[PDB]
Amino acid sequence: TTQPYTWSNVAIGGGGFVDGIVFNEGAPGILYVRTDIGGMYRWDAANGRWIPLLDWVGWNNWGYNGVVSIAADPINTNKVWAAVGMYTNSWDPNDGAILRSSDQGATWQITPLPFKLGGNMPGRGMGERLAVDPNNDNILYFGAPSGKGLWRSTDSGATWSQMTNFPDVGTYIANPTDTTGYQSDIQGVVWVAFDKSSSSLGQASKTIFVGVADPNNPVFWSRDGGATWQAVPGAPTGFIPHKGVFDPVNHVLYIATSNTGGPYDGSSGDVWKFSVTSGTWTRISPVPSTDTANDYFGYSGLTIDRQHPNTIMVATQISWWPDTIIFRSTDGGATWTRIWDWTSYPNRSLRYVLDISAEPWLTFGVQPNPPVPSPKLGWMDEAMAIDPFNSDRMLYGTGATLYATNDLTKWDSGGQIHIAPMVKGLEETAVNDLISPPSGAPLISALGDLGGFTHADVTAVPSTIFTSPVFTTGTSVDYAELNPSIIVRAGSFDPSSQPNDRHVAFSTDGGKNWFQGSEPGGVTTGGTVAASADGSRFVWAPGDPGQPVVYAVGFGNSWAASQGVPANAQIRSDRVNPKTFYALSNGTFYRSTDGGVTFQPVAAGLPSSGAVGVMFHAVPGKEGDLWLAASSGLYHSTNGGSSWSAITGVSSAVNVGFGKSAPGSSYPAVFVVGTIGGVTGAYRSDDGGTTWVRINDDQHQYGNWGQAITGDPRIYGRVYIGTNGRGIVYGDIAGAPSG
Ligand SMILES: [K+]
Ligand SMILES: [K+]
Ligand SMILES: [K+]
Ligand code: NA
Ligand code: NA
Ligand code: NA
Ligand code: NA
Ligand code: NA
Ligand code: NA
Missing domain, CATH: 2.130.10.10 (YVTN repeat-like/Quinoprotein amine dehydrogenase)
Incomplete structure (x- = not known):
């Protein structure tokens, strides 16, 4: 009945942590977000709301609301994948899976993996772990946790197996003595970035970068489409790379690093760029880790403006006080400006105006108390992304909400950008x-x-x-x-x-x-x-x-x-x-x-x-x-x-x-x-x-x-x-x- x-x-x-944001780079207006415990969503622009995509997940496969990574297909923009599974210890009784859809996540097919995933584990803000080859959408790579290494599909995500030639499964563990298994897991292989210039459409991309949670060897590459791998020579040491993004117009890799996997900490780190052509690593940190007095944070929320790829942004991972800082460079990292600055203490100049009219509870019951704002810009801002079809639109997640602006380029002209929650339909x-x-x-x-x-x-x-x-x-x-x-x-x-x-x-x-x-x-x-x-x-x-x-x-x-x-x-x-x-x-x-x-x-x-x-x-x-x-x-x-x-x-x-x-x-x-x-x-x-x-x-x-x-x-x-x-x-x- x-x-x-x-x-x-x-x-x-x-009300929760929005820990990844993925625009499709192939056509405008296709945007997804992931959460750690609350599935994933697609932006419905006509109705001005997020649509949840995994509410079909039930008690039998409940870990599948833990969303590890999202990849969006730029060749066939109807396609999207997700890696899912919630914990790698006893707390999730089920293995993870790769989900695939050909209707932007209205419907899905499921390929379980032979190991658990960590949608709500330490390090979850690092990514994206899952990536589709922008020259051939049959080919996907996935960076796995737990020492499972790097996985690949050559059938558009239907089947997966291990790349047994990959040389480093990761070494970093937040706390090896935790007997619950919560902090004691290898965080593993944390992102894959293709060099779209390295092939033509219809042929596998030959140059592939892979971020690894190993402070002594944070970046690997292949130049032959995965047949062989090497550490990228001269890669900086001492930090875990939260983020890796390739610019195939100027032929450079950007990475953002921190001394922990996050998402709740991070007290030092760097931003670097690697030139394919010269082999040269250039440190481009707004505040470098070598400035030990002033660098109290690592870096994450790395994003490139695809319409103007000399423009890049990064956020502190993590600054708890007085607020997070979001940085912007319009020259490839050579110089930076910031979203707020000290004038004379406790006073600050702000490059923004924050409106929480729709979500007034975001003051968390507390008045502003200078230098501390209420509401705050944020915290746990591992995810940030500029729209690849509109330089003015950017989103960034926090531990409690998702914020957006639609006038970002006012920053560059000395104005204030307007930031507001973008959470209609998103309940976490x-x-x-x-x-x-x-x-x-x-x-x-x-x-x-x-x-x-x-x-x-x-x-x-x-x-x-x-x-x-x-x-x-x-x-x-x-x-x-x-x-x-x-x-x-x-x-x-x-x-x-x-x-x-x-x-x-x-x-x-x-x-x-x-x-x-x-x-x-x-x-x-x-x-x-x-x-x-x-x-x-x-x-x-x-x-x-x-x-x-x-x-x-x-x-x-x-x-x-x-x-x-x-x-x-x-x-x-x-x-x-x-x-x-x-x-x-x-x-x-x-x-x-x-x-x-x-x-x-x-x-x-x-x-x-x-x-x-x-x-x-x-x-x-x-x-x-x-x-x-x-x-x-x-x-x-x-x-x-x-x-x-x-x-x-x-x-x-x-x-x-x-x-x-x-x-x-x-x-x-x-x-x-x-x-x-x-x-x-x-x-x-x-x-x-x-x-x-x-x-x-x-x-x-x-x-x-x-x-x-x-x-x-x-x-x-x-x-x-x-x-x-x-x-x-x-x-x-x-x-x-x-x-
Ligand atoms: K660039
Ligand atoms: K609602
Ligand atoms: K009642
Ligand atoms: Na009655
Ligand atoms: Na959370
Ligand atoms: Na009892
Ligand atoms: Na009992
Ligand atoms: Na483990
Ligand atoms: Na910190």
Whole structure:
């Protein structure tokens, strides 16, 4: 049974790291971006929006939203490829793949690779790893991580094998002692740049450069179309090349280097040019690494203006304070100017005007504090690209958004360029928790990096992230079910930089304004929080490992330890009885009936394994009525957790929530991301779990989604589902069910 639905994103706009930008060099108006956890997009200029291309990716192949590299075919501009896969350690159970499309990513074919890829690993801002030969589109190269070396396809990306003659698989490892495998992987072969001049169309390009993450040997080349390879003689040492771009008009290679792989660091590095004709390397760094006093950054975001290839740009990788710097040269690197300069301290002259009218929350809840701007130009600007058909258009990514200008050449004439977010249709947040209260705002969200929002209108970008306090990352939100103006949120931030602020905070006006009391010592992460049905008391399991579960009678006025419940348990409140709280920890279920003061175990040997951890939740209006989502099934208790029953027909559930009952039912509608009849997706039941209807489809899957889910108690059929890198999606009924 299926039901047609309409799916949309809650309006936020960007919110994550956009770590590559690829224009097609073959025809105008063809532009793609990649993200680390949130797929890739194509720019739709007619409608002024980004179109997501990988939302067909689901739970079975969820790593494919980790986009390692994009190549765009300049001979047949309908063609585009992507390298995909998210981690190279145990955290992604699947190998990566090369995806190919002949309709600009509307549809794709998949070739899995025999090894994992690192879309969300260290070094992900380096690239592009994947490249198409601009003289023969049958031929592609891919620089692989993990010591897999350099790969090639000679059938336009359908099949791949290793170039076993390539002499250096990479040596650089960010932290070889990391036993999780996250920092300890070889970063590998990091970009391929063709010399289009080195052949005529219809014949493979003979001269190929390859960037390698090996500070002693950062660049290799071939002159015979890959039959033989050598280190480019005289290549500079000591740094990893984030970027390599060839200019076949003047016959030079440009590289931008840093002492780390990025994307969060980089404290020294250089920009160099290599002349094919003379063999001469020329250092062209705006601030050279040999100027140890002043060079506090490496370099990345390397781009050439293809209409005027003496024009090149680069960005600091990385300058945290006072802001990033973006540099421009209109003479091949001989001289540079910058996007801002010191005048006399803390004053600066700016070559730009930054307008965040469409994305006002980008101040991150903080006023400008000279010399520090708010909003900032950016940070983690590994990606930057001038449009190869329009010198005035340039984009650059940051850790939180994508910025663009359409008047770039005003820079050269002594004016200010105009920069603004370019994120319509691009939603890249990672969602930890969601509530839809029965009065006030429709939706309050707990998000990675932004903290979260009170969303007055899910179609309108909010004005501000949560403030007083600002959270770096929101982990949990709740409301008092019978006093729904009372809201509680918990979250994560470094205490040393916010000592007046707390990791748990409150509102009595439905999330419009917040306030805070106290907290236990040593809290840095949010964990889970639960509000009593009357809003008079709260039970909180702070996030740091081993923090005792605590309760407050009041708004965090003061906290005392809850007896009988393990640190870091998942805490929920009953939606009816203001003195009843529940917890789940390592297969044991606990209940308190004295408002969180004491808990006792009431069931055990329960599910502890789930795709987003085991989730459970209490039902509005039904005392003691609990639903629990786990890898082995969806389970239901009607006696406060003392006993549980499998819901027949659901083989697995990621998460469960509730919304407004159907006409003629007095039970809330139940929504799950789960598996029914061998099909994983979103489902709603209007009769208390007896029957289920599928409410999404195979084009609307969103990968590892379901960390958060809630229905809307004011809108029958409406569901809000958190994703991990595609923001908050929501669904409405758009038709009658099939049966
Ligand atoms: K949107
Ligand atoms: K040039
Ligand atoms: K609700
Ligand atoms: Na990220
Ligand atoms: Na490895
Ligand atoms: Na730095
Ligand atoms: Na256990
Ligand atoms: Na236990
Ligand atoms: Na009803």
